[PDB]
Design a protein around this ligand. Structure first.
Ligand SMILES: [Ca+2]
Ligand SMILES: [Ca+2]
Ligand SMILES: [Ca+2]
Ligand SMILES: [Ca+2]
Lengths: 220, 226
DNA sequence: GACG
DNA sequence: GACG
């Protein structure tokens, strides 16, 4: 049963941030990669080769100046720091960023579904909190979201760690590239979604839920 | 030299793919922008090795890459060189070059420290005049009327003299780096290659960009519409 | 030239 | 768990 129709585009998403949830983190880097459903509908060996990302894709990767310092932990793994984001003149998560995101979304055929790894616990609530600071009305209040951890559990079971890298090494037998660059993680995430692309699309269509319903991570 | 319009804060590496070459009145099918602060080009390290290693992209970069359905068919050479076609672009539901696309570019650019300079290989003969006709077609004011632009062929020509060759993108790349470009089909692959070469002597490339920047609004359109 |  |  399809609660909101076929999702016409999938937007792979990854945030880098200042820290883990209980630090009440702020976003330092955001990457979206937008793929039409038909790119999966047209995506084999043991192991199969890492799938070739579709030719037709839209991509946005942005570095964002946070309002507070990165935790030592986050700085090391991301290679980002408030101090360097500022030296290099990055703007905060502001009203202009929300226009950018709206315009990027408006270029995708609707409905759209955000896809993030640990998205329900991490990227979705965090993104919600960032947006709630703005009171520009949120550009995501019409979009849908789903967690790729739950997706890949269902796929493998129909076919142990569900961390991005563990799944990727299990399917493909390679270490992933560019850990904790947001674009690098979005890539790695695409590759596992392209593992069984028809069944993944099916699952996403089954499980998409309104992003307006996602509770903020904190602040509320 | 004294600076035409002072120090350019952002360098935005730019590449377009399209349906063909200038005489065909081509339409844009893909666009990539990679924005970097000038500081990341005062921060590229000393190259150690032989052959010289391809430089690391800066960490802090903004990237936009978009596919664009053109209103006319891709020529055979453009299909082969880009792996894109109109039929396929429409199947993947890509929108035309429209007013929203301009709002997106404007917000992207407005996210940048000002002034910004567009950098594109053969930009003065291809990418800049083409971008101008695409924007002139819209009912949106041009998001690029305060943006500057510079051609990287003239940069690397002057850079390489300072240290009869081809100056096409991958020739410079393979000459500097002794390997083939990682990706020569996509707009993002060409920006990444242009970024690599522009990181060859980043101190001198900056010096040169600041001296040669011109308003994008003085860029004449590739072709009129009427 | 060199850009698609 | 798993996300910075
Ligand atoms: Ca992540
Ligand atoms: Ca990450
Ligand atoms: Ca080019
Ligand atoms: Ca190109």
């Amino acid at each position: 049963t399809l609660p909101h129709g076929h999702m016409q585009t999938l937007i792979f998403l990854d945030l880098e941030a200042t820290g883990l949830p209980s630090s009440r983190p702020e976003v330092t880097e955001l990457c979206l990669l937008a793929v039409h459903r038909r790119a999966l509908e047209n995506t084999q060996g043991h192991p199969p080769p890492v799938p070739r990302p579709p030719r037709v894709v839209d991509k946005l990767s942005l570095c964002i100046a946070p309002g507070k310092a990165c935790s030592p932990g986050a700085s090391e793994i991301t290679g980002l720091s408030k101090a360097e984001l500022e030296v290099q003149g990055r703007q905060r998560f502001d009203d202009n960023l929300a226009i950018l995101l709206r315009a990027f979304l408006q270029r995708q055929p609707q409905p759209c579904c955000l896809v993030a790894h640990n998205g329900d616990r991490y990227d979705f609530p965090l993104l919600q909190t960032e947006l709630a600071r703005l009171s520009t009305p949120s550009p995501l209040d019409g979009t849908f979201c789903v967690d790729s951890i739950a997706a890949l559990k269902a796929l493998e079971q129909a076919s142990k760690s569900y961390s991005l890298g563990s799944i990727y090494t299990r399917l493909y037998w390679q270490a992933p590239t560019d850990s904790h660059t947001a674009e690098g993680d979005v890539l790695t995430l695409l590759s596992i979604c392209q593992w069984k692309p028809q069944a993944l699309l099916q699952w996403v269509d089954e499980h998409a839920r309104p992003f307006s319903t996602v509770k903020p991570m904190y602040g509320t």
